[PDB]
């Protein structure tokens, strides 16, 4: 939770700061990552922007952005099966494809626009065979399965992946910021320290 | 090869600047008789350069374009041959005219400075194979060759060479051109004509309508590359999502209609407000206020990426459904 | 019917959940149904195919599975005991893919792939047309054709009554 | 002083050029990943579309159930076979495109080093005049 805000400020503190930090930030310990921002916030000197630091952040941001869409493709699958969980507790209903095939009889086709071909050959033979199942198994056979454990686990899947979005999208916002204004002058570093000291004002 | 308006004057200078490494090729000094005035006029102009230290770091190259003395200046690379040529020029004939004597008496000032001037000298003429020579030199000499379109690259670098040649010739300094500035200009020309004409041609496809509607706004190429990668990433996300069945294959209709609603809302918001700006400027403002919007919007009632909204906006503009320029339907389609 | 839609996003969805492949997978599952008992398939069986093979929460499990009936159904409920909403979603994926299945029947109804019989509504495949062998398939079709045959053979021992309790779908 | 004015002007120029160079490098890494990503997606699309020519041939050689001439084949199937034929040629990244991508990557690394050295020496002259 916190370390997303710490790691995003450390990475941009090598674009606009005095720290090189040749150890890998992904494998860096959290307690190392907090001393880097204290060096920037205390003293602001030796503005040595290097290509070895800038090229590291472009691969770091693109790996974070790649990780963002992989969480969202997994956050979608948790949210998609959550609606099918929520459809279970409100119940099942008959699908009634035989009645549904009649709605296509009264609607426009626009490809096979002649209505005497598809209805006389396909949709009405499909409707009459489907209507037999509305009179054969019309007894409400009970549906069970005890899906209460899926509600518990997908609650834990939702509370983990959405917690990752509140961390990962914090890293995108700090690293991108303004793509119109990624300035490298002396004024951009001076206003950068004010954002850093605001985040470290809450250490307790 | 290139547009052949440039003569051998620029061709040989660009070829000799190509085969260099941070060494300034100083003083082309176009000359068009062993006792001619313009020769010692040119060699007298390089006196104060090597006498000073702001130009020569003992790495410069001096040469001439278009006589026994010319072979004496050209065919001596070492110091002893330079000394022999200096004694031969010092004793060939008596001083004929003051217009050459006023340069010759200071040309005979220092033996070592004159010897280093001869050791860097190489007089050349060139011929009609100079565009072919420049083409072959760029083909077999440039690291990381760009052989698919080199005529226009040579056109821009010859335009730069001719521009610096005219700027040096009109004023009263010799042709001081460094290989560092030439390398930076050739690298900029190479990068501009590799990032756009081929690279950006691969990752947007014959000028599709979304990239042309971007071109009507004439916005910078960073937004062009961002639009191309957003459209490609959005198409690949659709492919991934319908391979694994994540989203049903008609929710793009509900996504695109809402986008029509937001585009109409932003068009009334930004086109009725100003009504006095250029069409490209109000199109740019409409495009940026559309891009910072339509990001909270939901596809198949769930959260979607920024890249998906940008790519579906660009693919929606590709079928001429929405636009950025106020006059776009009359221009294309 | 689904022709090429007038969207760039919906065209890419159309070329993958595509109607030429979808009329082939229905023909293969009909051929696996017709092989076991030489009986025409009830048209409600072919609607259940696309909940299995056009998703990934099912199609990646049919490739690991090799049994029949509840052996697959145990692979969500008790064999790994971590998921299990998937076979209850087959009823809901009928309504999602009813628009995909119905016209995949129609392209199969042309070109002599699936033949319906009079007004009774019984589908018979074309046994005179040789299907593609597994060698000439690509990588993705080798999964789907194996998935289409496996579902097409599992439904042969499935009568009208046990679809409502084992497959948990009611029509 | 006017010297501070021109120094800040060239510092702003170098800062904006380095911002553009970093954005161009991020984009060029995006296309470097997207070449093989779109190649894999196009391979999967081609694999999903490869049945279209076979269904075209069995439309050509068999007798359909539909009595009335329908343009379902003409409006559905050869679009899919045409997409398959286009994706067969538009699958692999060309060698000159990948070479141009790699050459632009190493050139933007070169301008990163060059403009980083320019950053280093301009901030030294700022910190020695102020």
TrEMBL record, chain B:
The source's domain of life comes to: Bacteria
- Do you know which InterPro entries this protein is assigned to? ABC-3C_CTD7 (IPR046913)
Q: Which Pfam families does this chain map to? A: CTD7
Where does the ABC-three component systems C-terminal domain lie? 210-331
What is the protein name given in its UniProt record? ABC-three component systems C-terminal domain-containing protein
TrEMBL record, chain C:
Please name the InterPro entries in this protein's record. ABC-3C_MC3
Organism, by scientific name, is Vibrio cholerae
The name this protein carries in UniProt is: Uncharacterized protein
Give the top-rank taxon of the lineage listed in the UniProt record for this protein: Bacteria
What Pfam families does the database record attribute to this sequence? MC3 (PF20131)
TrEMBL record, chain D:
Classify the source by domain of life: Bacteria
What is this protein's name? DUF3732 domain-containing protein
